[PDB]
Amino acid sequence: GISRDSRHKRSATGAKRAQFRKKRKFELGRQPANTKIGAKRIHSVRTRGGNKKYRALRIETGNFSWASEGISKKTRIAGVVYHPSNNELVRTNTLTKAAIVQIDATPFRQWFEAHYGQTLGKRAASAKIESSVESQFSAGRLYACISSRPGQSGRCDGYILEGEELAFYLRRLTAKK
Template identity: 30%
Template sequence: MIFQGRSKRKYTGKLYKRFRKKRKYELGREYVEALIGERKIKKIRVRGGNCKIRIYKDRYANVYIPAEKKVVKAEIKRVLENKAHIHFARRNVLTKGAVIETSVGKAVITSRPGQDGVINAVLVEE
């Protein structure tokens, strides 16, 4: 588990004295890398009783075609470019902003697969 509170040290390097324990609402979770493959999802209960759907693997994306003003379900072939991490394109990791090659052409992912539970993309005009 990841604790995302204040820093443990002051700017001088001295450790802060702990004034309380960690709280449940300060909980962080491990990052899930969405990959290309047969659809695999998991529902997670989050604060307020809400739900987040994590995508572990998915083969299809909802691609919006601006010229035709319609959305099509397209198969993802591979990740061409990913600015989130230099090795994500090589490993076919899907994140927001990643450029993917689909059956209808090149597209940019606009959703967050690890949080939204869906892969939405917009076709890039060449």
Template identity: 40%
Template sequence: MQWQAESVRKVTGGRRRPAQNKRRAEIGRAPADTHIGENRTRIIRTYGGNNFVVALRANYANVTDPKSGDTKKAKIANVEKNTANPNYVRRNLLTKGAVIKTEIGSARITSRPGQDGVINAVLLE
């Protein structure tokens, strides 16, 4: 579990005395780490009783061609580049901004698989 409230320490290093204790709503969750593989999703109950889908594994992406505007479902081969973390390329992690190799060509992921549960990408030139 990750606690996502304000830090006890200020930027200056001084101590901040919290007015309240930790709350259930301030708990975060571990990253989804979406991999390439047979589709696997998880439904998570969020604060307020809503649900959203988290993609744990995926092997297809909705790839849009910016010139024609056509969107096709393409199989993901591997991750070519990821500016967020070079280690993600070796682990084949799918994150927003990652460049993936598909059967259509190289594409950049525009959605957030760990938040949206789907992989949308834009075809590169």
């Protein structure tokens, strides 16, 4: 029932176009897959061509990368924090692209302790990192931006919010609280 032609719209002049032809399958749409947090479940929609497309209905874990030194780890997603389109999505815990979620820290801090010979909280020039990230580690959860499309690839991948990113989003969260 979801179709995306441009012939049901008003013209640019504000005229109204009468129907030209019956609706077509090569301009269809499909129901949005509200990905939520929970045990994994992934339907696979069959797409034009023979192709596939993995809608994620519920996803729990994810692949998140620390950009600053350039590593990637599989973590767990705790819950949505902020979403630049719908505070309703934040309320309902719906993962989509560009979301801000709190993720578990343990794989990252273990890699850190094991790579830089130093614990977190409480070559040292390289071991020196950002105050905000250190604080989040002390708490146990990080702010990370989901940067994939769970309705198109069945995945939550993301990056950990570094300096300017994190500054901006902390201001937004604090101002909206």
